[PDB]
Amino acid sequence: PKQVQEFKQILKLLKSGSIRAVRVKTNGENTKFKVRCAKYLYTYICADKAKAEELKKAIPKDIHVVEIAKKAP
Amino acid sequence: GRRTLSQRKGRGSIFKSRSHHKLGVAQHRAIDFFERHSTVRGLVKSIEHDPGRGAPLARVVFRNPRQYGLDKELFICAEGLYSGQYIYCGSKASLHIGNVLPIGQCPEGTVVCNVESKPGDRGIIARASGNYATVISHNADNETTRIRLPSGAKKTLKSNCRAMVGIIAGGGRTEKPILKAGVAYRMYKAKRTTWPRVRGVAMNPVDHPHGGGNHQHVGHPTTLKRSSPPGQKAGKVAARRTGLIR
Amino acid sequence: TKGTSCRGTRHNKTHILCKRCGKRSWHLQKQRCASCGYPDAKMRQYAWGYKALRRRTQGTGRMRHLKIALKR
Amino acid sequence: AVRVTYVRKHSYNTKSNGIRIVKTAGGNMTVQHRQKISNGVRCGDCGCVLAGIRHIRPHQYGWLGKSKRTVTRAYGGVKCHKCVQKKILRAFLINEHNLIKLAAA
Amino acid sequence: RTKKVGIVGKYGTRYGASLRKVIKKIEIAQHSKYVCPFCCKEAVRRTACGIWECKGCKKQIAGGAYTLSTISGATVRSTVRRLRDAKNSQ
Amino acid sequence: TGHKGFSYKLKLGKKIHQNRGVPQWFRMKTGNTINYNFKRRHWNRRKMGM
RNA sequence: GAUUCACGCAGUGUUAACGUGCAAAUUACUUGUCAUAUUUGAGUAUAGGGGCGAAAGACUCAUCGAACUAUCUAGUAGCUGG
RNA sequence: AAGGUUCCUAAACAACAUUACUUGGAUUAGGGUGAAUCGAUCCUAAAUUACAGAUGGAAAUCCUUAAGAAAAGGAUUGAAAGGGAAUAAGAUUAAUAGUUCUUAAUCAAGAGAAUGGUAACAUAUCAUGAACUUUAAAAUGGAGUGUGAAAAUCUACGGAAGAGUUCUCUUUUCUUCUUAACAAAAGUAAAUUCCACUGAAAUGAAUCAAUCAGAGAAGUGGAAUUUAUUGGCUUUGUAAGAAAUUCAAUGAAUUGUGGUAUUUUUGCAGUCUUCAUAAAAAUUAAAGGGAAUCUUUUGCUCGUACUAAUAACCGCAACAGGUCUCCAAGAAGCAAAAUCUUUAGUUAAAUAGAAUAACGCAGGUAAGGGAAGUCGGCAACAUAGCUCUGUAAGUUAGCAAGAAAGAGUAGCUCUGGUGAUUAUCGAAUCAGAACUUUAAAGGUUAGGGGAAUCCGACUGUUUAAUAAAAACAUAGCAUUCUGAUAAAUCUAAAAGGUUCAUUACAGAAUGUGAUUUCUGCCCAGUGCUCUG
RNA sequence: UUUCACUCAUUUCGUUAAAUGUUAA
């Protein structure tokens, strides 16, 4: 698993065709966007809800998105 | 009776040499043209400890005179050699310590070690620690020279036998008194199985010719002919004298 | 301690099964079979071992191909 | 104190059977197989350990980056920087001497 | 610390007074430091029997079993030097 | 042992297979004298020497 | 190749127990020893007038002043028993 | 290793486990052992075996690269403890699990002629590099001291949740508060080695110890490597969604920060020690040289159950005997000692009940005397830790020596000494003073001492199973032969074999037995030798 | 009749059977 550091690395990651699955985890403070690629599981820790919403707009429509919360799926 | 331990030693079962950590064969390089009509320069890369022998061994590195590459030798260290030294071998080599020269180019009274008894056989005589042989005389009539062996014997050799100038390192090794049985046990780490030597008189009549009766004694003279069969040849063989010397 | 006690350390095999005779007579360190005389081409037979000859010889097995030939 | 067991079938504390006990979830301690300690490169002349090259197993240099197993210098990775300076002086000074010694002395 | 048993006091009282006196001469010279014939520093210490290494000077020298240079190996170096000079000139 | 050769394990399996008894139907044949397998052994009774 | 204790080991004494035994050599206390002439596993080498032995004729699969096994062999007996 | 189905489940108890058995490692019948990453397979070590050759009447022996029209160079085997490409956490089964499932990775084989820094040296592949050669790694003893880090134990601050005690008190005692492989790089360590500036004497620098310096110290500024995966520790992705502790009837709650304490493990740094110098190959990288011009597929064969022992192994057995290892809590103490407890395991391990005779086996005590017993203080008793004082003759001057001998030691309440940061914080250790008592090492653990004589010098070894010694060994002393085509010596023979990878400071064969002192006279006899 | 001189069987060795011998240069 690799951690991306800024937004522009994960905007570029999503618009590529190599995505395989996205899981969104909501925690007490932050939100993690664990994009599952072919090799690694890249994740982005965001601390602003507005920035989190922008990421969900950029997610393609043919890809499955899983939302995880205080209860495991 | 049984077979005495001297007989069992010739079989070589537990009496084989403990030569596993030994460095190699310490000898001169093979004789060729450049050692017979020119000189080769060798570099003393390192000086190392060969198990089972008192003298150190030098890792000399000659260039290959006919091909491209190196030629790694293993000499016996003359006392004085150091790492990074240059040594020259050949008929035209200078008379410096560590240089290998034919025995005929050395002046009278010079000191050589690791002498060849027969040309091209890469060293026979004067190889132990501190030992050396001295050149006595030359004979240009038949190209033969006389040297004095470290035992005091005089030997005649062909004048083209090679030898290294100097004294073998590690002198005075045997002047330090061993003190403990443990130290003598450690001496034969890279040698044969011979150390704890039971007296024959302490044995039994089957095991040894000395195996005595109600008093520990030999009972017959301990000086024997050279032609005694193995098994009864114990003591002193062909002894011309005995007792303490005055 | 030459009796009961010294038997505890016996856990190392000396012989294992042989490929040619099927018996546990293959000496691991001698690399030969004590019974059928392995890699030696000829089978190990002796005249003093007359019982050993009547235990493994011709006619003690299936005779898969010789039973037809002699019957023929 | 939680006591552990060897995971593999080796049962002797040989050099290749080194283990490290680490902690895991719930207070359980598991067994990790730890690597052996290697040696670095040495100068071919003075036998001193070179700088800039890591001390890892010989096959692990295949996984290393191509620039992380040698130093960008003549005889890099085989000779110390002092081992090389004397090489240059020997090559130059001796050749200079052989120009005044022979060649119309 | 000791009156007349300098280094062989580690042997205690169990090898004969003479044998401890004899080994004292060798054991002092075996562990002693010698003047290095190249860098002239008292920094040569024995590694093995017959091998001596200059510590702060990067050299290995072949010498005696317990001393850097023996008496027999000292007159030989001079003897060869004299013969070398005589051979060159006439 | 835990570690064993391939052929040795199959000769161990056959020894397991031969440690069985006479099936009941075989005992009901006319003129039958085979009731028990006298080549039977148990791990703690006799070691099979292999 | 100093003095000791401990995990272990040995086997000084009781000439204790046991002595158709827990055991075809063991147990208890006591004693000695308890890392460099140390302890120990696996692999490997040495074979019967042979090997191996810090040497007791000790050890060489409960077998040793010449192993075990089979053949010569139903060895011979002026001796003993029927 | 050895065993081999002994593993698990169900039915069932005739036999077996010195009574019995519903129990069983016993009877019957089914079920169970899943790997690209763990091992074998691969490499070589001591050693071992082939074709051709050599030897032999023969069977067969020798040789292992030397003898060969054989093998760029030397053949086969030899390690489940030596070397080696790569996998971890959680869950799951009546039983397999670094093997299955979920999740997350890694490795191999593929398929799609450069910059920067003074320098040490540095740049997600980058940034070409053939033949040939070299270097390094794999790959190398032990002791002891200091120290970095992790874990465990202990402890300080701050809480959350649950349990125990509670007529006598106790803001109390106890349990949980966790995190993998592989990677990232906010913050930040210890040690060593190098680089640049400058040039040390009024010599400095530094350690527990040392040790270092004009072929250049200390100072300042840098570079590199090591520290159980990337980069050592905290932290981060993994990853809280797991797991642990609670509550409710699947769903909810929390998961701070420290320590100048101890142990273990793991490295590092120099010191000591050797007539001891403490493996090789497979395999990999780099250099010198200048020839040439992210996605996806596959990862085969075999072992894998169980015991590993006061019941699965070897001893005829469910035998008090024997058999190689890994992990390892509290008290107390110098102590991994004796003694007691925690997690885990077990209460059965060749049958019991009653009575409480003699003679026994094991453990004890005793009036007065004190070895008078006996071959003999055999057996038992006795001294015993720590602190202080004190300690003979003799001596190889090192020891004797814990010589011998004498004094102190408890509990409670206090006082002082030994540090760190600028008053607070911490370490168990030493000394001292009053008071009280049953006057204190002694529950356990825990040397009897002295004066002489004989032997062996010492540490060591020995008759497995009646002798552990004064016997053997030992270092020391001494004698003999041998120039290596030799000496000794194995073989029937042998371009055969051992000491010998050797070379007189060596090899081989012997006697005496440390040190000190001394080794007297005899060459007729028997040996051995001679240049006669 | 030992006493010699050569090598040609023979003995003992060394290497990668790698400049031995005689002229020339």
PDB file of C-alpha atoms (C1' of nucleotides) in Angstrom, chain H residues 37-227:
ATOM      1  C1'   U H  37       7.564 -17.656  -0.959  1.00  0.00           C
ATOM      2  C1'   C H  38       8.542 -23.598   4.512  1.00  0.00           C
ATOM      3  C1'   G H  39      11.950 -27.631   3.262  1.00  0.00           C
ATOM      4  C1'   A H  40      13.904 -31.779  -0.181  1.00  0.00           C
ATOM      5  C1'   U H  41      15.208 -30.708  -5.280  1.00  0.00           C
ATOM      6  C1'   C H  42      20.451 -26.676  -6.170  1.00  0.00           C
ATOM      7  C1'   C H  43      26.091 -26.109  -4.185  1.00  0.00           C
ATOM      8  C1'   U H  44      30.198 -27.933  -2.274  1.00  0.00           C
ATOM      9  C1'   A H  45      33.013 -29.873   3.082  1.00  0.00           C
ATOM     10  C1'   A H  46      35.322 -34.395   5.575  1.00  0.00           C
ATOM     11  C1'   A H  47      34.829 -38.362   2.487  1.00  0.00           C
ATOM     12  C1'   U H  48      32.749 -41.622  -1.919  1.00  0.00           C
ATOM     13  C1'   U H  49      32.196 -44.141  -6.894  1.00  0.00           C
ATOM     14  C1'   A H  50      32.491 -44.682 -12.683  1.00  0.00           C
ATOM     15  C1'   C H  51      34.745 -45.218 -18.769  1.00  0.00           C
ATOM     16  C1'   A H  52      39.860 -45.743 -20.493  1.00  0.00           C
ATOM     17  C1'   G H  53      44.769 -46.838 -17.967  1.00  0.00           C
ATOM     18  C1'   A H  54      47.925 -49.616 -14.203  1.00  0.00           C
ATOM     19  C1'   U H  55      48.060 -54.321 -11.056  1.00  0.00           C
ATOM     20  C1'   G H  56      46.532 -59.474 -10.032  1.00  0.00           C
ATOM     21  C1'   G H  57      46.362 -66.928 -10.913  1.00  0.00           C
ATOM     22  C1'   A H  58      41.603 -65.194  -9.398  1.00  0.00           C
ATOM     23  C1'   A H  59      37.805 -62.638  -7.299  1.00  0.00           C
ATOM     24  C1'   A H  60      38.961 -58.095  -7.648  1.00  0.00           C
ATOM     25  C1'   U H  61      42.446 -54.077  -6.167  1.00  0.00           C
ATOM     26  C1'   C H  62      44.772 -49.135  -7.450  1.00  0.00           C
ATOM     27  C1'   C H  63      44.164 -44.163  -9.732  1.00  0.00           C
ATOM     28  C1'   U H  64      39.952 -39.226  -9.454  1.00  0.00           C
ATOM     29  C1'   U H  65      43.030 -35.949 -13.323  1.00  0.00           C
ATOM     30  C1'   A H  66      47.657 -38.415 -13.060  1.00  0.00           C
ATOM     31  C1'   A H  67      48.928 -42.357 -17.372  1.00  0.00           C
ATOM     32  C1'   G H  68      43.742 -40.901 -22.247  1.00  0.00           C
ATOM     33  C1'   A H  69      42.655 -38.437 -29.791  1.00  0.00           C
ATOM     34  C1'   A H  70      38.254 -38.932 -22.804  1.00  0.00           C
ATOM     35  C1'   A H  71      36.097 -35.220 -18.946  1.00  0.00           C
ATOM     36  C1'   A H  72      36.396 -23.349 -22.065  1.00  0.00           C
ATOM     37  C1'   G H  73      38.525 -26.970 -18.359  1.00  0.00           C
ATOM     38  C1'   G H  74      37.957 -31.105 -15.428  1.00  0.00           C
ATOM     39  C1'   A H  75      33.745 -36.877 -14.142  1.00  0.00           C
ATOM     40  C1'   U H  76      29.629 -39.269  -9.818  1.00  0.00           C
ATOM     41  C1'   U H  77      27.735 -38.958  -4.998  1.00  0.00           C
ATOM     42  C1'   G H  78      28.151 -36.614  -0.329  1.00  0.00           C
ATOM     43  C1'   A H  79      24.262 -31.646   4.734  1.00  0.00           C
ATOM     44  C1'   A H  80      15.595 -31.706   5.832  1.00  0.00           C
ATOM     45  C1'   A H  81      21.729 -28.149  11.847  1.00  0.00           C
ATOM     46  C1'   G H  82      26.854 -25.607   6.577  1.00  0.00           C
ATOM     47  C1'   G H  83      25.713 -21.700   1.738  1.00  0.00           C
ATOM     48  C1'   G H  84      20.508 -20.490  -0.635  1.00  0.00           C
ATOM     49  C1'   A H  85      15.653 -15.573  -5.175  1.00  0.00           C
ATOM     50  C1'   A H  86      10.907 -14.342  -3.014  1.00  0.00           C
ATOM     51  C1'   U H  87       4.616 -14.153   2.579  1.00  0.00           C
ATOM     52  C1'   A H  88       2.607 -11.601   6.435  1.00  0.00           C
ATOM     53  C1'   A H  89      -1.821 -10.416   9.709  1.00  0.00           C
ATOM     54  C1'   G H  90      -6.747 -12.026  10.942  1.00  0.00           C
ATOM     55  C1'   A H  91     -10.366 -15.969  10.482  1.00  0.00           C
ATOM     56  C1'   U H  92     -11.508 -20.970   9.715  1.00  0.00           C
ATOM     57  C1'   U H  93     -11.839 -27.485  10.718  1.00  0.00           C
ATOM     58  C1'   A H  94     -14.407 -32.926  14.850  1.00  0.00           C
ATOM     59  C1'   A H  95      -8.278 -32.943  12.822  1.00  0.00           C
ATOM     60  C1'   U H  96      -4.512 -29.227   8.000  1.00  0.00           C
ATOM     61  C1'   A H  97      -2.485 -24.795   7.821  1.00  0.00           C
ATOM     62  C1'   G H  98       4.059 -19.171   7.075  1.00  0.00           C
ATOM     63  C1'   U H  99      -0.021 -24.514   2.685  1.00  0.00           C
ATOM     64  C1'   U H 100      -7.093 -23.192   3.048  1.00  0.00           C
ATOM     65  C1'   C H 101     -10.317 -18.232   2.993  1.00  0.00           C
ATOM     66  C1'   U H 102     -10.194 -12.634   3.143  1.00  0.00           C
ATOM     67  C1'   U H 103      -7.023  -8.716   2.678  1.00  0.00           C
ATOM     68  C1'   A H 104      -2.372  -6.968   1.612  1.00  0.00           C
ATOM     69  C1'   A H 105       2.896  -8.066  -0.853  1.00  0.00           C
ATOM     70  C1'   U H 106       7.247 -10.136  -2.783  1.00  0.00           C
ATOM     71  C1'   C H 107      10.576 -13.051  -6.391  1.00  0.00           C
ATOM     72  C1'   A H 108      12.104 -15.502 -10.955  1.00  0.00           C
ATOM     73  C1'   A H 109      11.359 -16.476 -16.221  1.00  0.00           C
ATOM     74  C1'   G H 110       9.323 -14.064 -19.832  1.00  0.00           C
ATOM     75  C1'   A H 111       5.679 -11.008 -23.692  1.00  0.00           C
ATOM     76  C1'   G H 112       4.204  -5.885 -24.982  1.00  0.00           C
ATOM     77  C1'   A H 113      26.145   7.133 -25.649  1.00  0.00           C
ATOM     78  C1'   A H 114      24.049  12.231 -18.840  1.00  0.00           C
ATOM     79  C1'   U H 115      24.372  15.721 -14.914  1.00  0.00           C
ATOM     80  C1'   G H 116      25.646  17.856  -9.756  1.00  0.00           C
ATOM     81  C1'   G H 117      29.375  18.548  -5.539  1.00  0.00           C
ATOM     82  C1'   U H 118      36.294  21.643  -4.071  1.00  0.00           C
ATOM     83  C1'   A H 119      36.101  16.821  -1.937  1.00  0.00           C
ATOM     84  C1'   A H 120      34.422  12.706   0.633  1.00  0.00           C
ATOM     85  C1'   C H 121      30.227  11.491  -2.675  1.00  0.00           C
ATOM     86  C1'   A H 122      24.861  12.093  -4.770  1.00  0.00           C
ATOM     87  C1'   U H 123      20.848  11.686  -8.611  1.00  0.00           C
ATOM     88  C1'   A H 124      11.511   6.828  -8.704  1.00  0.00           C
ATOM     89  C1'   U H 125      15.420   2.353 -14.842  1.00  0.00           C
ATOM     90  C1'   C H 126      17.652   6.156 -16.269  1.00  0.00           C
ATOM     91  C1'   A H 127      22.010   8.426 -18.390  1.00  0.00           C
ATOM     92  C1'   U H 128      24.636   1.769 -24.125  1.00  0.00           C
ATOM     93  C1'   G H 129      28.862  -1.253 -23.032  1.00  0.00           C
ATOM     94  C1'   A H 130      31.136  -7.594 -26.309  1.00  0.00           C
ATOM     95  C1'   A H 131      35.599 -10.807 -25.854  1.00  0.00           C
ATOM     96  C1'   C H 132      39.350 -10.883 -22.009  1.00  0.00           C
ATOM     97  C1'   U H 133      41.338  -9.877 -16.737  1.00  0.00           C
ATOM     98  C1'   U H 134      40.934  -8.387 -11.716  1.00  0.00           C
ATOM     99  C1'   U H 135      38.476  -7.161  -7.017  1.00  0.00           C
ATOM    100  C1'   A H 136      34.758  -7.869  -3.477  1.00  0.00           C
ATOM    101  C1'   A H 137      30.453 -10.579  -1.356  1.00  0.00           C
ATOM    102  C1'   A H 138      28.472 -15.656  -0.085  1.00  0.00           C
ATOM    103  C1'   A H 139      32.837 -16.476   3.868  1.00  0.00           C
ATOM    104  C1'   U H 140      34.545 -17.527   8.984  1.00  0.00           C
ATOM    105  C1'   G H 141      37.692 -18.420  16.368  1.00  0.00           C
ATOM    106  C1'   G H 142      37.131 -17.254  21.443  1.00  0.00           C
ATOM    107  C1'   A H 143      37.177 -14.229  25.966  1.00  0.00           C
ATOM    108  C1'   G H 144      36.029  -9.976  28.569  1.00  0.00           C
ATOM    109  C1'   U H 145      34.470  -4.476  29.080  1.00  0.00           C
ATOM    110  C1'   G H 146      31.445  -0.214  27.585  1.00  0.00           C
ATOM    111  C1'   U H 147      27.205   1.212  24.916  1.00  0.00           C
ATOM    112  C1'   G H 148      22.801   2.101  21.023  1.00  0.00           C
ATOM    113  C1'   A H 149      17.919  -0.228  20.217  1.00  0.00           C
ATOM    114  C1'   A H 150      13.644  -3.568  20.838  1.00  0.00           C
ATOM    115  C1'   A H 151      10.845  -6.863  23.901  1.00  0.00           C
ATOM    116  C1'   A H 152       9.665  -8.554  28.917  1.00  0.00           C
ATOM    117  C1'   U H 153       9.384  -7.216  34.046  1.00  0.00           C
ATOM    118  C1'   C H 154       8.990  -2.929  37.354  1.00  0.00           C
ATOM    119  C1'   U H 155       7.447   2.001  37.951  1.00  0.00           C
ATOM    120  C1'   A H 156       5.411   7.807  37.332  1.00  0.00           C
ATOM    121  C1'   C H 157       1.384  10.881  35.497  1.00  0.00           C
ATOM    122  C1'   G H 158      -3.745  10.763  33.217  1.00  0.00           C
ATOM    123  C1'   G H 159      -8.200   8.183  32.539  1.00  0.00           C
ATOM    124  C1'   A H 160     -12.080   4.563  30.428  1.00  0.00           C
ATOM    125  C1'   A H 161     -14.525  -0.433  31.265  1.00  0.00           C
ATOM    126  C1'   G H 162     -15.300  -4.765  34.299  1.00  0.00           C
ATOM    127  C1'   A H 163     -14.347  -7.842  38.680  1.00  0.00           C
ATOM    128  C1'   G H 164     -12.823  -8.763  44.213  1.00  0.00           C
ATOM    129  C1'   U H 165     -13.143  -7.056  49.663  1.00  0.00           C
ATOM    130  C1'   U H 166     -16.369  -4.151  52.575  1.00  0.00           C
ATOM    131  C1'   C H 167     -19.049  -4.230  59.441  1.00  0.00           C
ATOM    132  C1'   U H 168     -13.417  -3.282  60.778  1.00  0.00           C
ATOM    133  C1'   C H 169     -10.716  -0.122  57.647  1.00  0.00           C
ATOM    134  C1'   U H 170      -9.321   0.529  52.385  1.00  0.00           C
ATOM    135  C1'   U H 171     -10.145   7.864  46.902  1.00  0.00           C
ATOM    136  C1'   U H 172      -8.580   0.522  47.720  1.00  0.00           C
ATOM    137  C1'   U H 173      -6.628  -4.598  45.165  1.00  0.00           C
ATOM    138  C1'   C H 174      -6.918  -6.854  40.387  1.00  0.00           C
ATOM    139  C1'   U H 175      -7.794  -7.515  34.537  1.00  0.00           C
ATOM    140  C1'   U H 176      -7.705  -4.927  29.202  1.00  0.00           C
ATOM    141  C1'   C H 177      -6.059  -0.485  26.992  1.00  0.00           C
ATOM    142  C1'   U H 178      -2.785  -4.324  20.717  1.00  0.00           C
ATOM    143  C1'   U H 179      -0.912  -4.434  15.731  1.00  0.00           C
ATOM    144  C1'   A H 180       2.164  -7.967  10.715  1.00  0.00           C
ATOM    145  C1'   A H 181       4.829  -8.627   5.976  1.00  0.00           C
ATOM    146  C1'   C H 182       6.013  -4.919   2.549  1.00  0.00           C
ATOM    147  C1'   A H 183       6.776   0.447   1.731  1.00  0.00           C
ATOM    148  C1'   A H 184       6.835   6.125   3.046  1.00  0.00           C
ATOM    149  C1'   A H 185      10.057  10.032   5.050  1.00  0.00           C
ATOM    150  C1'   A H 186       6.881  15.139   9.338  1.00  0.00           C
ATOM    151  C1'   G H 187      10.523  14.914  13.557  1.00  0.00           C
ATOM    152  C1'   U H 188      15.077  12.932  15.458  1.00  0.00           C
ATOM    153  C1'   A H 189      19.505   9.458  17.760  1.00  0.00           C
ATOM    154  C1'   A H 190      24.325   6.463  19.024  1.00  0.00           C
ATOM    155  C1'   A H 191      28.961   4.739  17.140  1.00  0.00           C
ATOM    156  C1'   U H 192      32.868   4.365  13.461  1.00  0.00           C
ATOM    157  C1'   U H 193      35.472   5.856   8.961  1.00  0.00           C
ATOM    158  C1'   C H 194      36.511   9.561   5.479  1.00  0.00           C
ATOM    159  C1'   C H 195      36.346  15.234   3.108  1.00  0.00           C
ATOM    160  C1'   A H 196      37.269  20.814   3.107  1.00  0.00           C
ATOM    161  C1'   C H 197      39.493  25.236   6.017  1.00  0.00           C
ATOM    162  C1'   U H 198      43.677  25.974   9.490  1.00  0.00           C
ATOM    163  C1'   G H 199      48.193  24.220  11.389  1.00  0.00           C
ATOM    164  C1'   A H 200      49.298  21.762  17.728  1.00  0.00           C
ATOM    165  C1'   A H 201      54.772  22.545  22.065  1.00  0.00           C
ATOM    166  C1'   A H 202      53.209  26.519  27.360  1.00  0.00           C
ATOM    167  C1'   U H 203      51.913  19.688  23.881  1.00  0.00           C
ATOM    168  C1'   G H 204      47.185  18.793  23.378  1.00  0.00           C
ATOM    169  C1'   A H 205      42.787  15.392  22.604  1.00  0.00           C
ATOM    170  C1'   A H 206      40.091  11.491  24.728  1.00  0.00           C
ATOM    171  C1'   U H 207      38.166   6.163  27.239  1.00  0.00           C
ATOM    172  C1'   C H 208      35.422   2.050  32.169  1.00  0.00           C
ATOM    173  C1'   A H 209      40.341   0.531  29.938  1.00  0.00           C
ATOM    174  C1'   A H 210      42.779   2.501  26.263  1.00  0.00           C
ATOM    175  C1'   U H 211      44.425   5.130  22.350  1.00  0.00           C
ATOM    176  C1'   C H 212      45.843   9.169  18.730  1.00  0.00           C
ATOM    177  C1'   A H 213      48.557  13.356  16.216  1.00  0.00           C
ATOM    178  C1'   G H 214      53.334  17.694  10.943  1.00  0.00           C
ATOM    179  C1'   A H 215      52.701  10.742   5.631  1.00  0.00           C
ATOM    180  C1'   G H 216      48.785  15.879  10.391  1.00  0.00           C
ATOM    181  C1'   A H 217      45.740  16.402  16.440  1.00  0.00           C
ATOM    182  C1'   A H 218      41.661  19.392  18.758  1.00  0.00           C
ATOM    183  C1'   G H 219      37.873  23.287  16.459  1.00  0.00           C
ATOM    184  C1'   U H 220      34.150  24.516  12.644  1.00  0.00           C
ATOM    185  C1'   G H 221      31.342  22.888   8.459  1.00  0.00           C
ATOM    186  C1'   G H 222      30.224  18.303   5.652  1.00  0.00           C
ATOM    187  C1'   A H 223      29.915  12.967   3.340  1.00  0.00           C
ATOM    188  C1'   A H 224      29.191   7.800   4.069  1.00  0.00           C
ATOM    189  C1'   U H 225      27.872   3.055   6.476  1.00  0.00           C
ATOM    190  C1'   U H 226      25.869   0.153  10.550  1.00  0.00           C
ATOM    191  C1'   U H 227      21.698  -0.046  14.223  1.00  0.00           C
TER     192        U H 227
END
